[PDB]
From Swiss-Prot, chain A:
Ranges where the record places region Disordered: 20-37
Organism expressing this protein natively: Saccharomyces cerevisiae (strain ATCC 204508 / S288c) (Baker's yeast)
Function, as annotated: Required for ribosome biogenesis.
Complex and partners: Component of a hexameric 5S RNP precursor complex, composed of 5S RNA, RRS1, RPF2, RPL5, RPL11A/RPL11B and SYO1; this complex acts as a precursor for ribosome assembly.
Knocked-out gene: effects: Depletion causes defects in processing of pre- rRNA and assembly of ribosomal subunits.
Highest classification ranks of the organism: Eukaryota, Fungi, Dikarya, Ascomycota, Saccharomycotina
Residues of the full protein shown: 154 to 201 of 203
Protein name (record): Regulator of ribosome biosynthesis
UniProt record similarity statement: Belongs to the RRS1 family.
Domain of life, per lineage: Eukaryota
Subcellular location per the Swiss-Prot or TrEMBL entry: Nucleus
From Swiss-Prot, chain B:
Organism, scientific name: Saccharomyces cerevisiae (strain ATCC 204508 / S288c)
Biological process according to GO: cytoplasmic translation
Localization: Cytoplasm
Key word Lipid metabolism present: no
Taxonomic lineage: Eukaryota, Fungi, Dikarya, Ascomycota, Saccharomycotina
Name under which the protein is recorded: Large ribosomal subunit protein eL21A
UniProtKB/Swiss-Prot annotation, chain C:
Gene from which this protein is expressed: RPL7A
Compartment(s) of residence: Cytoplasm
Portion of the parent chain present: 123 to 244 of 244
Swiss-Prot/TrEMBL GO biological process terms: cytoplasmic translation; maturation of LSU-rRNA; maturation of LSU-rRNA from tricistronic rRNA transcript (SSU-rRNA, 5.8S rRNA, LSU-rRNA); ribosomal large subunit biogenesis
UniProtKB keywords: Cytoplasm, Ribonucleoprotein, Ribosomal protein
The protein, known as: Large ribosomal subunit protein uL30A
Species of the source: Saccharomyces cerevisiae (strain ATCC 204508 / S288c)
KW Transmembrane (keyword) present: no
Function statement: Component of the ribosome, a large ribonucleoprotein complex responsible for the synthesis of proteins in the cell. The small ribosomal subunit (SSU) binds messenger RNAs (mRNAs) and translates the encoded message by selecting cognate aminoacyl-transfer RNA (tRNA) molecules. The large subunit (LSU) contains the ribosomal catalytic site termed the peptidyl transferase center (PTC), which catalyzes the formation of peptide bonds, thereby polymerizing the amino acids delivered by tRNAs into a polypeptide chain.
UniProtKB/Swiss-Prot annotation, chain D:
Disulphide linkage map: none
Broad class of where this protein is predominantly found: cytoplasm
Function text: Component of the ribosome, a large ribonucleoprotein complex responsible for the synthesis of proteins in the cell. The small ribosomal subunit (SSU) binds messenger RNAs (mRNAs) and translates the encoded message by selecting cognate aminoacyl-transfer RNA (tRNA) molecules. The large subunit (LSU) contains the ribosomal catalytic site termed the peptidyl transferase center (PTC), which catalyzes the formation of peptide bonds, thereby polymerizing the amino acids delivered by tRNAs into a polypeptide chain.
Residue numbers bearing the N6,N6,N6-trimethyllysine modification: 36
Intracellular or extracellular location(s): Cytoplasm
Entire protein: shown range: 15 to 148 of 186
Biological source species: Saccharomyces cerevisiae (strain ATCC 204508 / S288c)
GO CC, alphabetical: cytosol; cytosolic large ribosomal subunit
Lineage, broadest ranks: Eukaryota, Fungi, Dikarya, Ascomycota, Saccharomycotina
Entry protein name: Large ribosomal subunit protein eL18A
Length: 37, 119, 122, 134
RNA sequence: GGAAUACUGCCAGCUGGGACUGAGGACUGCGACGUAAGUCAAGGAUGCUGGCAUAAUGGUUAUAUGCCGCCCGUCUUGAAACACGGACCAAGGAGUCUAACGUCUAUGCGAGUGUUUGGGUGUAAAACCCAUACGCGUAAUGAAAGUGAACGUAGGUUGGGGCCUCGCAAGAGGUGCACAAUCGACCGAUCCUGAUGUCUUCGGAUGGAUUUGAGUAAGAGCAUAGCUGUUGGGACCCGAAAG
RNA sequence: AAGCUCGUAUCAGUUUUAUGAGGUAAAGCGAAAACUUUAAAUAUGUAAGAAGUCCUUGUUUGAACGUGGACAUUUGAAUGAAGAGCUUUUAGUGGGCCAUUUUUGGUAAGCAGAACUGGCGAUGCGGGAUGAACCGAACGUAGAGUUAAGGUGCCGGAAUACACGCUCAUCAGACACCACAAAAGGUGUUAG
RNA sequence: GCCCUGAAAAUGGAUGGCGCUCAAGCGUGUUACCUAUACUCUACCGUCAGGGUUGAUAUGAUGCCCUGACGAGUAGGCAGG
RNA sequence: GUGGCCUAUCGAUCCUUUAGUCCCUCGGAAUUUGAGGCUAGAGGUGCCAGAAAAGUUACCACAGGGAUAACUGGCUUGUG
């Protein structure tokens, strides 16, 4: 979806990267949670 | 190269993920990397409204009324050049009439026969 | 209008009408249009009161405007009601009919035999 | 396209029977308007107040005309000086009738109007506010 | 070298045989032949002749002959049929009444409207008359205390049926109802600004910024009747296993 | 329909002109078969003006909103017709077969999923001996004429018509047809 | 190009049937003929639309007169009886 | 010197907390504790709770709907 030219309905790929990094950081946060407990 | 709200633009892909591929729309939005287009699509018998997001190299400008403006200019020109005289202007476009009678001459041209020999 | 004919070829028969077939059609199956209503001509008063604003004032002036395609042709044509023809009196020939006139049929452009067709459908 | 009065009022039937003839032989556009207005239902024929009639006569140059209402002419108590008009209409409430006659004008009906102004000269047509209801 | 016939086409050329049709009901029109008066195949049939006057034409009916016609109703869109009901007859048999809201139409009155819970009366469950009250309406808005609709000719522009003026007529000009769009003015709520006076904290003068309401900006509702829609009542009818 | 609220010189499953994209290549030929310029229509897109155009020239010398003023009909291709939208408001119905045209994926074979055009359901009438999907076909009551598709030995209305060829089958052939058996065998016959 | 083999069972049997071999079979061409509720013209019924008309003693004013185009139908909708 | 590093979902409108210039209300009237509103803020699935509170019955009763099995597509036979 980065290079895919037209998207068929905010720029819609930036939201996609935003959610990507959202889940990535949730994972990397829960990593610390498990390390501490 | 400044696409704004209201402009009218074509689509061109310099794989086949979506095929609008040369349907002309109107811009409603612009960003540093993408553009927004609207499209009228026939769903049954009516033109319903679709929205689209396209990159910059995958778009261009249109040349639709390019002849319209030149022709209304020249219409205005000959209109006054007609008022400035006595005239039968007739400033409308007509379709291709049927061609009229002529005579062809056979002096360097004696008709060179051929048959389906084939050759 | 050439491409209209090229579209609807498989359903029609057309060609180039002579003067005498136009004359016969207009004289025998010619009905005008007084604002509506498909009125029969039978007279020059009906033509004159309805097309005298274009210089046509007789059934012969109407035939002239038709055959020698004129600048009041659109109006002189849309004055007349589409002609109601009957089946041909000798038949069409052609055991089968929906094939191109070139291929032994009826539809398409016969280009001069439209007179021999219309004079029997008249 | 409404053509026939749906009521049974015999006098309204007569009024239509006169106006169809007038509008068929007169070609003055006023008559066709009045005829079309005589077919309207009671919810499309709202009333018009003496105060709206007065405000209508208060425009410039229109102080000597006859005003015509196809509905009713109600009254209003919020005005104190009423002009010396002449109103033709269908109905008159007692209040409006007394107010106009005390002002000094006349009250008449559509058929007396048909006799007076046949083509419809020097007339005004007013319609009450329709969509104000729900 | 001079012709002819064939073939395709045109004639506002001529002349025979056959079949179906005769709508219309004083006159008016467009025409043709006429020296003319007049005649005519020109805006839809008349002239002459014969037979019989009744079961002859025609109708109803029984049968024969030629061709045609798969058994009804219901339930599933395809083998679209299958499947379920039908022995025959007569009588009975299924979208009704009511209560509450709503659209539309008719009538009565109209900024109002509704006599009939009651009283008076009578030719006695009829008809006729009536006082005081009450509902709905004539005003909203705030969570609430509360507050509560004119800068002007009740507004500026954009069109707007009609009307007046000029015009031979098209047209031009003036005025503009209802209604629609936009910028305004007013009322309530929210945020600020915070006087003249105050009992030292009361009170809210004058002016602004958005957002919001079926708000105001010369009222339109009330009442009964009819067709109807939604909901409840056994609710179009019959058919069941329960507590 | 209830519905009156506006009818405009406006609409349209159509063509044409301008401009796009598909580019296969048939173009031909490119400076050496790579070139990068080119021909028609092939189905989809957009446009073709009277609330449209012209003149002074403010806003912070280009562009955008201006002020104020001016141009009405050969008015800007063809063809056909005066008929949609707004709100009030409402009855029945809401997921399937057949065939055709393109694309995607397929296998012993059939096929599976798409979008599009007809038909059927609600539908009679002529023909295919019989028939939802095949071929004709604009359903009031009648008279005359002419025909579509299909046919003209008899059943059965209509030429045991005319003309040129091919075929002999020990259950020929007279069709859903250009499909499976289908690629081959034959001292059967014809023409290349 | 025609023709013969190129497999496929079971009550009796189907180019629709009789029958047909210089065809009544296969390819093709020129004509004449038969026939639908389709096309053309005419008369009658109805629907829709466009025109004219209360003027008297002549009448049915939701009337009367002139003209033109149309008519399939389930659920459902309207109008007249 | 390489043939890996990590992971529950879920709301976030079922609610956590707090303060008011002279903010408004609490039914006969006051005062003080108290409650309730709307105006502010400050917090966000860490800490809870769950997409419904378990089976079995062959006497099993009532109202409905069901076949037709050998024929989609000319399929079937002797040699992978």
């Amino acid at each position: 979806l980065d290079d895919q030219w037209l998207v068929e309905v905010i720029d819609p790929r930036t939201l996609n990267r935003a959610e990507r990094k959202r889940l990535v950081k949730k994972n990397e946060k829960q990593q610390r949670r498990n390390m501490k407990n | 190269k400044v696409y704004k709200v209201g402009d009218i633009v074509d689509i061109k892909a310099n794989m086949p993920h979506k095929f609008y591929q040369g349907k002309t729309g109107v811009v409603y939005n612009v960003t540093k990397s993408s553009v927004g287009v609207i499209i009228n699509k026939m769903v049954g018998n009516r033109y319903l409204e679709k929205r689209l997001n396209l990159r910059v190299e995958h778009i261009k400008h249109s040349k639709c009324r390019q002849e319209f403006l030149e022709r209304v200019k020249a219409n205005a020109a000959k209109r006054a050049e007609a008022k400035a005289q006595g005239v039968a202007v007739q400033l409308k476009r007509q379709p291709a009439q049927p061609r009229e009678s002529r005579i062809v001459s056979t002096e360097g041209n004696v008709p060179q026969t051929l048959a389906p020999v084939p050759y | 209008t050439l491409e209209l004919l090229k579209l609807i070829e498989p359903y029609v028969a057309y060609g180039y009408p002579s003067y005498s077939t136009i004359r016969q059609l207009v004289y025998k199956r010619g009905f005008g249009k007084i604002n509506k209503q498909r009125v029969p001509l039978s007279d020059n008063a009906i033509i004159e009161a309805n097309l005298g604003k274009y210089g046509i004032l007789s059934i012969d002036d109407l035939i002239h405007e038709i055959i020698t395609v004129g600048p009041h042709f659109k109006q002189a044509n849309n004055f007349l009601w589409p002609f109601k023809l009957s089946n041909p009196s000798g038949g069409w020939g052609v055991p089968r009919k929906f094939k191109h006139f070139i291929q032994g049929g009826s539809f398409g452009n016969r280009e001069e035999f439209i007179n021999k067709l219309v004079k029997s459908m008249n | 396209h409404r053509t026939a009065p749906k009521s049974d009022n015999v006098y309204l039937k007569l009024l239509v029977k006169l106006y169809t003839f007038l509008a068929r032989r007169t070609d003055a556009p006023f008559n066709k308007v009045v005829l079309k207005a005589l077919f309207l239902s009671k919810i499309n024929r709202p009333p018009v107040s003496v105060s709206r009639i007065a405000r209508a006569l208060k425009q410039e140059g229109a102080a000597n005309k006859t005003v015509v209402v196809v509905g009713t002419v109600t009254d209003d108590a919020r005005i104190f000086e009423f002009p010396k008009t002449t109103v033709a209409a269908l109905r008159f409430t007692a209040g409006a009738r007394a107010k106009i006659v005390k002002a000094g004008g006349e009250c008449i009906t559509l058929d007396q109007l048909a006799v007076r102004a046949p083509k419809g000269q020097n007339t005004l047509i007013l319609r009450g506010p329709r969509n104000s209801r729900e």
